[PDB]
């Protein structure tokens, strides 16, 4: 057999040469003329020559987790946090286990997501004349939002913009006395601009409520307002925006309609948009040199930014928004009203449904040593290698299961090696120690 | 600039004092604009120990700090408090009043002279105790003289760095 | 013997105030004197005279002289007592001519012409002859009674400079004729029509007077104005403009006039009223403890959509307001406390454009 | 979840010859808004100044050497040309999320400023400045001593005022 | 295809003044015919005013590159009245500067129609500025000019016609009744105004700003919920009420909610007969519209352009490439479902932003229309398709593709944005297109060349090779060799009788490469053979006889494996100039190669 074939000086090498060769010390059954080798073989062939169990040495291992830890039933529900320490994303966390060649131990780890992920959003208010009735919902729907944005995750970013109309003559009355203002004497508006950028993204809910009290109404001639133009500069304006890779919700408020591509013909505009960020000092100076965008460029621009749109409009324009929403993918239209329950909801329902990826790194092992992973998903999903590592589609407060294998060829020292086994973007780890020994006991 | 900043109050505080310190603003409306307290430590390092907000409806404070100090502001005497209890060896360093120019940018623009508040040790003071009086007040003698040696040492070595620059301008 | 006087010669002025006859002196030397005598033909009742000259003037005057009446005219050379043939001619005097003419109460439909008639003359009647000043080949001759100095003169074309000239006339005499130069009035403009009413503006239509205008005049007041009302100024060409800007549920008043030159028509006023988009007939068709139900009347202009707005009299809190579709007319309030007043303010938006801009509110006061 | 915003600056001190170019970077755990961003530099002896705001802007009374670029986590103060005057302690603050953390201030200073042979090539100008500048940073030691020595002085001071 | 493409003709004009925003012929005398072109931000000697533009007259031959601006206003803005002592010093009541003057030009006869969109005044009554438009009637060869402004009137601001910008889109009839549309009046909802040119000369008053035209045809008020509708957008004139009297079709792009429509308004009774309604929300639908036969059936159909219209790929990628739909008139009536689309194949192509009809290129009896997509192309310099007249329907695949020859600026090219077509320029009896690039300040004309068909006919009677007999021995042993008969058959109009083919006969073509040729002619010899014959259009047919032998040699292994036979007949390439210096074309359809095959018997 092969531990025959093994010639082993020593008992240790046997082990090292296979996992069911064992190794004879006594001598009695082992011919004085054979070498050492004869001693090493199958613990059936051992006992057959008539060796004693007690001389014949066959070391093994147990597997044996040195901690565990319970994962958390909670699981953050209801956007609730006790604590960082307090959630456990892995049970076996630190673990201590024996490798014997031809004795492959393996260990079931269960990872369970106690944690939210982070939600950025910004809100762009429309300041046209004829939104002097409806400011006061406007006003009151932000610190709502706010308070829904703290309910529904412990880390956030809230940010607003406001637009008013194209600094041109057709659009805006040019005559210098409706230039400073274009309401009756007796009110005070303020100018018409393009877009003007109030607050970057914060994570300060404070500032965010004292901002939106102090915006004051504008004014201009035309029944619809250049929404879009806006749109089109924060979704590309990344830097002065301040976005991150986090999941990003845009909510647009118009009680009116929207320009597109084509109504610049009549102003003198004949430049299409170029989707470039031509912001300076936080205010769009290129508002008459570029053309409204059009509802397909738009689209493609809000695709390759993964940026969510929801609208809230009025009763009256929304036939008119309905259509819009079939349009544009992964977007929800929603009424502006006083109570800005529907709002809300839409918001809250977005937030629930999220879907995310755990992959699992191992650090280096020996050679001639080699881990397998077997990844257990929702709906039966198994993938085995590397697919079997990976698991998506795993909402909050799912917990999936994963077998992993740990076998030892031959034994590269004698003291044990810690390694460390974390999901990518999860902090906790999964740390491994392996013992290997040549040297029968 | 033209906005003049003046902090007064700062003394030496036993371990779990209480020490109160008022900033006085002047040459532009306190209320309108967002006050902040900073301090920088005996390392050189800067660190923000509270921020209240011009309406006073909110403020904001550190977790260190935080729960163990309060600021609050006086809109008719136009003075920033800043109130310091349960003080520990940690808290002595160089307070600064300041003010934030715009709340968007959350900038400060205008820093204050600051007053230093550092906090002293009674441990020594318990092995005072035991010595008797007569013994105890020769002691008080001999740290006079060192403290001046000490002082003595900088400014000699100030006035090498000193001579260099003199020679060059005497030349030109 | 004496030589009488040769070439005599009488001149007739149209009034005879002063009559002079002249005739060539005697040729016999040392003449005392030259008389001259005027008798009515036919031995007739006439006021005959007898008048007396020098050998040097040959030129005598006849006073008192009779109109309509021949008067033979004989003039005796006179030397001592004895006087030679006397020269004998006829003259019929001729009749005074008017003065004085003035023209009162000019109109351009009819005109009125009052002058003075010759002094102490009893004329047989009064002839007057006008015609238009560019229409010369047309006169009207109207004969007026002696002893009334003021004629009438009637269908006068408008705007048409009329040259009237009236001489006095005794027998077959006719006098010298007075020219008095006036100008007739304008025509008013007519068939003023109002199209396109709308709340803020409405069109008015107006025809041309027949004589030639160079401007049209148009003022348009409400019956109460703070201030007196603006005015336009259109050309003739354009009979048609249209007043806009106006405030609904307002009636106008507007005064249309003509004017050539100087010259204004007569005024042609057009009463319009604007249209009222306001609300009618609020009332509450069915109420619970809680809650209230308000049925108004749907206005006459086309509105987007109602503002319901609901408060406490009571106390100055902010009043709550929910917006509701333009085609339903009937609203639901709830939540309200059962046993205190609530003040009801229904609003119309009609603003078209970026304006926001509504109409006047029609409130109740419901007790719960 | 109390998660907190890292600052870094990558030369914590170094010196240089007059007319050099340094360049001081800024790095930031976690992506933020540029008008957040700003730069303060501080005079020994002194008290902090806003030198730029939004990493863009320069604060009136600042001289047109000084520069500031970046976006996302990465930003950087550039200096044209060194000047004594320049010799300060930079911090790089951001104010985008709570808490306001600043990072460490750069202690920039002048390489062999007291040898005497670099001191031939100054102004008669420059030199007057040099010399106003060591009076601020002189009396601010003595000052710190005198504090050191009146705190031990207390407890011992304490304890025979009881007696 | 007959478009001189290698030989097109340019045009240049000052930087920054968008020449070639509009491209009109002006033919008022025979010998007087030209191409106006108009340039709306070019710079005008008359003070006051600047970028009013103006209209530059270039006559056709002599030097193409010189042109001349058109005086149609010498003066500067008049100024107010009131203003002379009711505040010191004057102010205008209206503005010349940036009239963007030019911006449309058409012609008709001895008549120009030149309108200013832009074009505002401040109003006496109130000091506030509505851009009502403004435009000017040239006839008799500039005899007298005529300044046309019905938007202007008493109803002021955006709630009368105060904004209309009347001349934003303009026409003009076979009769000459100039058709004019406005969309900014009625707060947007769009307007069309329509009046004779011998009505516009008797009302025509320069005294008074504001002139009432009696006889004026327009558009009654609509409802509040029409408003921001932008009618009067896009204007054109055809037949469709059949009472032999012009009708106007106008396109309303943000009609119905957005999705758009095309209606036809009748001339006298000016009462909507039909209605067009888009397809998709948002596609701009009525951008262009044009009339025109492209069945030949003598009844006039509609083309309408939707650029911004976007469709799903096969992958399932959305993209914008934007469709043209065609609507057949039947003797019945217009049908409302479209018969055929056209989508485009770029990306923001803007396909259909622009349709002109080309009439007749091919004179085959069938109409043909050319549209332009001005950001089509790999460059994105822009395009412009020529699609051919079809009698049962118009032909989805285009026919020639139109690019710019010059390379490619940082600027955009804005090619094909203005496309005139359907009259013949260089008297030719084929008519011409011209393109406009006001982008890049330049204007391109094209000039159709005349085309001749031909028919190739050859045929051999000694199909089967005899090995036992040959009938000719040139060589010392006889060999057996096949007359073939080729006759060659060409047909042109107003070409020259005398045409010129060259005509190349190939023998064993599929085994000349690699292999031994088993055909050669009886005296050359040659597997190929090029031979020039002259055809007179006048002669009925052509042939000419050869001989072409089959090798005696027992060389070739299989003597019964067939020989393939090839003639081709092309158009000579020399020489080909003509008097009217366009080169002639060759029918694609005809048939310029024929191919034979023999073979021999083997025992
Ligand atoms: C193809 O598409 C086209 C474009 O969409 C269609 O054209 C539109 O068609 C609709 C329906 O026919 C029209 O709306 C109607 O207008 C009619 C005309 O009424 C006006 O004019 C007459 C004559 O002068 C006048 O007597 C009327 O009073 C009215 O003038 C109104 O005057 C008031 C004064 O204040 C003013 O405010 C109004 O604005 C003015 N016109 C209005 C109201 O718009 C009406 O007769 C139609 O019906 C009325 O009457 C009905 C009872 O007989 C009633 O039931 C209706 O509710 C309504 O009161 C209706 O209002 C659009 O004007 C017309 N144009 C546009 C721009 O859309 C076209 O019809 C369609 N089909 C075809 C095949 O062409
Ligand atoms: C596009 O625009 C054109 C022009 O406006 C329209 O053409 C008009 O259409 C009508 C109807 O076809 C024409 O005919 C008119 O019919 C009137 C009604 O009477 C009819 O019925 C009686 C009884 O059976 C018949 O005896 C009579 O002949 C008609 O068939 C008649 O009253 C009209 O005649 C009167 O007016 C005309 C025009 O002024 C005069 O010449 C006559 O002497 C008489 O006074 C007439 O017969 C009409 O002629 C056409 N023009 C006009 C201006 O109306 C198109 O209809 C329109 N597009 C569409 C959709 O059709
Ligand atoms: C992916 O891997 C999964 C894990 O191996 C697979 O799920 C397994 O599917 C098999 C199908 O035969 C199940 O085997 C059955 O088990 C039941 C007992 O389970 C039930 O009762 C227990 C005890 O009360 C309860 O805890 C379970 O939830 C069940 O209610 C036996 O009665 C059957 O006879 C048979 O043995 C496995 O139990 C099941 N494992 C688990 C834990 O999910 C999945 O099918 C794989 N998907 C694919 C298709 O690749
Ligand atoms: C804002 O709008 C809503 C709807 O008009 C107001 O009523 C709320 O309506 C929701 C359902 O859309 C209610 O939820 C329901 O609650 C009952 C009882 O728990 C439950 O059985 C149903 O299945 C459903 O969950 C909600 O209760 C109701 N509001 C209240 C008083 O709870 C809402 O009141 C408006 N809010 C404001 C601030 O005006
Ligand atoms: C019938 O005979 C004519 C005339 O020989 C053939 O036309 C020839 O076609 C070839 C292409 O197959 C031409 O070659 C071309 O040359 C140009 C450069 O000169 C090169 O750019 C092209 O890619 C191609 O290689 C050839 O020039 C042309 N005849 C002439 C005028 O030289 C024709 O192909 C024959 N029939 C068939 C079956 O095509
Ligand atoms: C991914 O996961 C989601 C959410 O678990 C699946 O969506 C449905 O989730 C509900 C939850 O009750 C199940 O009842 C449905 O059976 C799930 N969908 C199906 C198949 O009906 C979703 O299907 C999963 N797969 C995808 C497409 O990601
Ligand atoms: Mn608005
Ligand atoms: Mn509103
Ligand atoms: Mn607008
Ligand atoms: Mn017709
Ligand atoms: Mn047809
Ligand atoms: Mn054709
Ligand atoms: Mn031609």
């Given at each position: ?222 029944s ?33 309609g ?58 009256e324009?929304?036939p008119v ?121 | ?172 | ?195 396109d009413i709308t709340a803020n503006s ?73 249209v009222?988009d ?20 749907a206005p006459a202009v086309t509105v987007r959509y ?19 579709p333009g085609s ?20 119309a938006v009609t603003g078209r454009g ?15 | ?163 | ?157 955006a709630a009368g ?22 969309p900014?009046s009625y707060f947007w909802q769009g307007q ?27 558009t009654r008020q609509a409802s509040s919920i029409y408003d921001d509708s932008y009618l ?20 309303v792009?943000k009609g119905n909610l957005?999705?758009?429509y095309?209606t ?7 009462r909507s007969?039909?209605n ?328």
């Amino acid at each position: 057999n092969r531990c025959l074939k093994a010639n082993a000086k020593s008992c240790g090498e046997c082990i090292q040469a296979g996992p069911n060769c064992g190794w004879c010390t006594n001598s009695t059954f082992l011919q004085e003329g054979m070498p050492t080798s004869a001693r090493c073989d199958d613990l059936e062939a051992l006992k057959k020559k008539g060796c004693p169990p007690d001389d014949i040495e066959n070391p093994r291992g147990s597997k044996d987790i040195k901690k565990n830890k319970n994962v958390t039933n909670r699981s953050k529900g209801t956007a609730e946090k006790l604590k960082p320490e307090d959630i456990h994303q892995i049970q076996p966390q630190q673990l201590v286990l024996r490798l014997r060649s031809g004795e492959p131990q393996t260990f079931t780890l269960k990872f369970k997501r106690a944690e939210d992920y982070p939600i950025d959003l910004y809100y762009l208010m429309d300041l046209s004349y004829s939104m002097k009735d409806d400011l006061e919902n406007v006003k009151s729907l932000g610190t709502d939002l706010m308070n829904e944005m703290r309910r529904i995750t412990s880390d956030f970013r809230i940010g607003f913009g406001s637009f008013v109309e194209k600094t041109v003559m057709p659009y805006i009355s040019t005559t210098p006395a409706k230039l400073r203002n274009p309401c009756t004497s007796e009110q005070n508006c303020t100018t018409p601009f393009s877009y003007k950028n109030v607050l970057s993204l914060t994570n300060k809910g404070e500032v965010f409520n004292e901002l939106v009290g102090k915006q004051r109404i504008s004014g201009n001639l035309d029944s619809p307002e250049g929404g879009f133009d806006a749109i089109m500069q924060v979704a590309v304006c990344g830097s002065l925006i301040g976005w991150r890779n986090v999941t990003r919700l845009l909510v647009f408020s118009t009680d009116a309609g929207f320009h597109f591509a084509g109504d610049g013909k009549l102003g003198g505009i004949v430049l299409p948009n170029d989707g470039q960020c031509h912001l300076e000092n936080n205010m769009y100076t290129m508002s008459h040199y570029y053309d409204y965008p059009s509802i397909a460029h738009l689209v493609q621009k809000l695709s390759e930014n993964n940026i969510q749109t929801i609208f809230a409009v009025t009763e009256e324009f929304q036939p008119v928004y309905k259509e819009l929403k079939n349009l544009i993918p992964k977007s929800a239209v929603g009424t502006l009203s006083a109570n800005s329950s529907n709002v809300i909801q839409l918001i809250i329902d977005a937030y629930n449904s999220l879907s995310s990826e755990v992959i699992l790194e191992n650090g280096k092992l020996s050679e001639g040593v080699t881990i397998s992973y077997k990844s257990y998903c929702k709906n039966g999903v198994n993938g085995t290698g590397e697919n079997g590592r990976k698991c998506s589609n795993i909402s909050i407060g799912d917990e999936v299961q994963f077998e992993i294998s740990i076998t030892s060829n031959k034994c590269p020292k004698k003291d044990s090696d810690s390694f460390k086994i974390r999901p990518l973007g999860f902090t906790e780890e999964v740390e491994v120690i392996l013992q290997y020994i040549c040297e029968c006991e | 600039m033209d906005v003049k900043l003046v902090e007064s109050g700062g003394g030496l505080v036993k371990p779990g004092g209480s020490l109160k310190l008022s900033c006085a603003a002047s040459g532009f409306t306190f209320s309108s604009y967002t006050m902040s307290w900073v301090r920088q430590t005996p390392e050189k390092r800067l660190e923000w120990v509270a921020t209240i907000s011009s309406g006073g409806s909110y403020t904001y404070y550190p977790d260190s700090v935080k729960g163990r100090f309060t600021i609050s502001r006086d809109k008719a005497k136009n003075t920033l408090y800043l109130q310091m209890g349960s003080l520990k060896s940690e808290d002595t360093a160089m307070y600064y009043c300041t003010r934030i120019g715009y709340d968007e940018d959350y900038a400060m623009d205008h820093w204050g002279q600051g007053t230093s508040v550092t906090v002293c040790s009674g441990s020594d003071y318990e092995f005072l105790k035991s010595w008797t009086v007569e013994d105890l007040q020769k002691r008080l003698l001999a740290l006079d003289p060192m403290m001046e040696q000490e002082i003595e040492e900088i400014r000699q070595k100030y006035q090498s760095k000193r001579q260099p620059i003199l020679d060059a301008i005497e030349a030109k | 013997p004496l030589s009488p006087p040769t070439n005599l010669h009488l001149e007739a002025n149209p009034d005879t105030g002063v009559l002079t006859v002249s005739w060539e002196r005697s040729t016999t030397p040392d003449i005392t004197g030259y008389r001259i005598t005027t008798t009515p033909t036919n031995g007739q009742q006439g006021n005959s005279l007898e008048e007396v000259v020098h050998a040097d003037q040959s030129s005598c005057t006849f006073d008192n002289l009779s109109p309509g009446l021949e008067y033979n005219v004989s003039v005796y050379t006179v030397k001592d007592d004895k006087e030679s043939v006397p020269i004998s001619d006829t003259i019929i005097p001729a009749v005074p001519p008017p003065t004085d003419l003035r023209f009162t109460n000019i109109g351009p439909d009819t005109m009125r012409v009052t002058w003075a008639p010759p002094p102490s003359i009893d004329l047989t009647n009064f002839l007057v002859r006008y015609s238009p000043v560019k229409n010369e080949e047309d006169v009207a001759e109207l004969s007026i009674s002696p002893s009334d100095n003021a004629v009438v003169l009637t269908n006068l074309l408008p705007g048409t400079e009329y040259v009237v000239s009236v001489s006095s006339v005794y027998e077959q005499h006719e006098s010298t004729p007075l020219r008095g130069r006036q100008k007739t009035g304008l025509d008013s403009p007519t068939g003023i029509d109002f199209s396109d009413i709308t709340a803020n503006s409405f069109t008015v239509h107006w025809i041309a007077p027949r004589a030639t205008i160079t401007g049209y005049r148009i003022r348009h007041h409400p019956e109460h104005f703070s201030g007196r009302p603006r005015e336009d100024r259109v050309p003739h060409s354009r009979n048609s403009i249209t007043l806009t800007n106006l405030t609904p549920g307002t009636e106008y008043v507007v005064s249309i006039v003509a004017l050539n030159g100087r010259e204004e028509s007569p005024l042609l006023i057009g009463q319009q009223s604007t249209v009222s988009d306001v609300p009618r007939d609020l009332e509450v068709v069915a109420a619970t403890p809680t809650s209230l139900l308000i049925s108004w009347d749907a206005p006459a202009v086309t509105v987007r959509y109602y503002r319901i707005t609901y408060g406490e009299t009571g106390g100055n809190s902010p009043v709550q307001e929910f917006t509701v579709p333009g085609s339903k007319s009937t609203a639901t309030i709830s939540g309200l406390k059962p046993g205190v007043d609530y003040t009801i303010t229904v609003y119309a938006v009609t603003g078209r454009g970026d304006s926001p801009a509504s109409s006047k509110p029609i409130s109740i006061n419901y007790r719960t | 979840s109390h998660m907190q915003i890292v600052v870094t600056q990558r030369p914590t001190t170094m010196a240089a010859s007059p007319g050099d170019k340094i360049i001081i970077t800024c790095s930031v755990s976690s992506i933020i808004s540029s008008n957040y961003l700003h730069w303060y530099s501080q005079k020994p002896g002194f008290s902090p100044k806003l030198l730029i705001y939004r990493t863009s802007n320069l604060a009136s009374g600042v001289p047109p050497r000084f520069s500031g670029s970046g976006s996302g986590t990465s930003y950087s103060l550039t200096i044209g040309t060194m000047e004594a005057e320049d010799v300060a302690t930079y911090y790089c603050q951001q104010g985008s999320d709570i808490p306001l953390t600043f990072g460490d201030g750069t202690k920039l200073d002048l390489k062999r400023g007291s040898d005497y042979e670099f001191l031939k090539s100054w102004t008669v100008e420059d030199l007057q400045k040099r010399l106003l500048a060591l009076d601020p940073m002189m009396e601010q030691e003595i000052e710190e001593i005198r504090q050191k020595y009146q705190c031990k002085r207390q407890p011992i001071l304490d304890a025979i005022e009881a007696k | 295809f007959n478009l001189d493409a290698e030989a097109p003709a340019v045009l240049s004009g000052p930087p920054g003044s968008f020449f070639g925003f509009s491209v009109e012929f002006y033919r008022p005398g025979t010998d007087g015919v030209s191409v106006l072109v108009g340039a709306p931000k070019a710079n005008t000697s008359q003070p006051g005013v600047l970028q009013g533009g103006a209209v530059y007259l270039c006559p056709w031959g002599a030097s193409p590159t010189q042109c001349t601006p058109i005086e149609f206003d010498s003066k500067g803005s008049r100024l107010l009245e009131s203003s002379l002592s009711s505040s010191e010093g004057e102010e205008p009541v209206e503005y010349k500067s940036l009239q963007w003057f030019g911006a449309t030009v058409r012609a008709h006869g001895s008549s120009i129609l030149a309108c200013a969109p832009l074009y505002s005044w401040r109003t006496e009554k109130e000091p506030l500025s509505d851009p009502v438009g403004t435009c000017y009637l040239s006839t008799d060869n500039f005899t007298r000019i005529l300044e046309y402004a019905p938007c202007r009137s008493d109803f002021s601001w955006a709630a009368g016609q105060g904004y209309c910008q009347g001349g934003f889109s303009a026409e003009f009839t076979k009769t000459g009744r100039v058709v004019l549309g406005g969309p900014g009046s009625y707060f947007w909802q769009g307007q069309i105004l329509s009046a004779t040119q011998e009505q516009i000369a008797e009302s025509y008053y320069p005294e008074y700003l504001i002139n009432l035209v009696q006889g004026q045809l327009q558009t009654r008020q609509a409802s509040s919920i029409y408003d921001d509708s932008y009618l009067g957008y896009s204007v054109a004139v055809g037949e469709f009420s059949g009472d032999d009297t012009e009708d106007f079709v106008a396109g309303v792009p943000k009609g119905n909610l957005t999705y758009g429509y095309v209606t036809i308004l009748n001339g006298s009774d000016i009462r909507s007969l039909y209605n067009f309604s888009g397809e998709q929300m948002a596609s701009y639908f009525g951008y262009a519209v044009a009339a025109t036969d492209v069945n030949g059936d003598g009844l006039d159909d509609l083309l309408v352009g939707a650029p911004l219209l976007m469709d799903r790929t096969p992958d399932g990628r959305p993209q914008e490439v934007g469709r043209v739909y065609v609507y057949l008139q039947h003797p019945a009536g217009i049908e409302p479902t479209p018969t055929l689309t056209l989508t485009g194949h770029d990306e923001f192509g803007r396909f259909g932003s622009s349709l002109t009809p080309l009439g007749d290129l091919d004179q085959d009896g069938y109409n043909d229309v050319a549209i332009g997509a001005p950001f089509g192309g790999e460059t994105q310099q822009g395009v412009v398709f020529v699609f051919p007249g079809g009698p049962g329907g118009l032909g989805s695949k285009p026919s020639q593709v139109l690019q710019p020859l010059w390379a490619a600026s940082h600027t955009p090219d804005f090619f094909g944005s203005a496309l005139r077509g359907g009259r013949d320029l260089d008297g030719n009896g084929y008519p011409d297109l011209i393109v406009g690039s006001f982008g890049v300040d330049k204007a391109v004309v094209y000039r159709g060349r005349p085309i001749v068909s031909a028919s190739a006919s050859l045929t051999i009677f000694p199909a089967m090779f005899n090995p036992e007999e040959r009938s000719c021995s040139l060589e010392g042993n006889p060999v057996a060799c096949i007359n073939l008969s080729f006759c060659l058959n060409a047909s042109g109009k107003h070409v020259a009788d005398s045409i010129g083919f060259t005509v190349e006969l190939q023998l064993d073509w599929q085994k000349q490469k690699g292999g031994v040729r088993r055909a050669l002619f009886l005296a050359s010899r040659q597997a190929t053979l090029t031979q020039t014959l002259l055809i007179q259009n006048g002669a009925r047919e052509d042939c000419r006889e050869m001989k072409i032998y089959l090798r005696n040699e027992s060389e070739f292994r299989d003597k019964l494996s067939p020989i393939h036979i090839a003639l081709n007949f092309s158009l000579d390439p020399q020489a080909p100039v003509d008097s009217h210096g366009l080169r002639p074309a060759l029918h694609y359809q005809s048939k310029s190669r024929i191919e034979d095959k023999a073979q021999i018997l083997l025992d």
